[PDB]
């Protein structure tokens, strides 16, 4: 015989387990992978837009007053190169993290070990690759702002998140740190690439709009 509390417990523990099981989903990681794919496609579109801007400027007002356009074109190309430095750095990091991913899983759609929570923290926090990436982000944002100093680049920013629960986090510990799955880290690198391309588009548009 059991007390009423024991019947309550012995019936509700399975309901609670069902609630807990329902409340945790692999769809978080599927969402991270799909967001990465969408960010990559939109970045391709943004790069196409930048190329169209360059072609437009190249035979709309460059052919008329080159003595005025050559400095503008040179500044735009310099901004392109500055952003490309960060773009290549992020590409190297993405290949590094995907190589240690563990081989693409065709059943899921992305890399195996996509939910490891430790590969990214072992390759970006332990060896400090994330700190170097953050320094590159900050340096390229500052150098982009130097060419304009007028428009504001609300994309390129390695700012630390506002503290919560008394504790404080750094940008590298927030984007690639502990608890971040490998798929989330690859998505974060793709986000940094998209932010760099958006900033490049903004600065190129402003520079070409100066004349």
């Amino acid at each position: 015989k059991e007390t009423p509390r024991q019947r309550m417990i012995g019936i509700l523990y399975l309901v609670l387990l069902g609630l807990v099981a329902l409340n945790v989903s692999d769809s978080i990681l599927d969402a991270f992978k799909n967001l990465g794919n969408s960010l990559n496609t939109s970045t391709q579109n943004t790069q196409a837009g930048i190329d169209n801007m360059f072609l437009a400027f190249r035979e709309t007002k460059l052919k008329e007053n080159p003595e005025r356009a050559q400095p503008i074109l040179q500044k735009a190309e310099q901004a392109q190169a500055l952003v490309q430095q960060l773009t290549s750095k992020v590409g190297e990091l993405t290949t590094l993290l995907e190589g240690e991913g563990g081989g693409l899983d065709e059943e899921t759609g992305d890399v195996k070990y996509r939910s490891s929570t430790d590969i990214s923290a072992r390759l970006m926090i332990n060896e400090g690759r994330a700190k170097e990436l953050r320094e590159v982000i900050t340096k390229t944002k500052a150098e982009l702002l130097t060419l304009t100093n007028n428009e504001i680049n609300l994309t390129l920013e390695a700012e630390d998140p506002a503290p919560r629960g008394g504790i404080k986090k750094t940008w590298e510990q927030a984007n690639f740190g502990d608890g971040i799955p490998l798929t989330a880290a690859i998505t974060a690198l793709e986000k940094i690439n998209a932010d760099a391309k958006n900033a490049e588009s903004a600065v190129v548009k402003h520079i070409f709009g100066k004349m």
Partner: protein
């Protein structure tokens, strides 16, 4: 077939509904509701006992 039988059978419906919901089957969201309403009603009734 006392009140205890309905305490168990009402749990069977809830657990089968949980099975259907977790396995992403078709009609499991209704069994959870019916079984849990029956369970709440039976626990309410059983409070009127010595």
């Amino acid at each position: 077939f006392g009140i205890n039988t309905l305490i168990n059978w009402g749990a069977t419906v809830v657990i089968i509904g949980l099975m259907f919901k977790i396995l992403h089957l078709k009609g499991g969201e209704w069994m959870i509701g019916v079984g849990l309403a029956v369970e709440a009603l039976l626990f309410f009734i059983m409070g009127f006992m010595q």
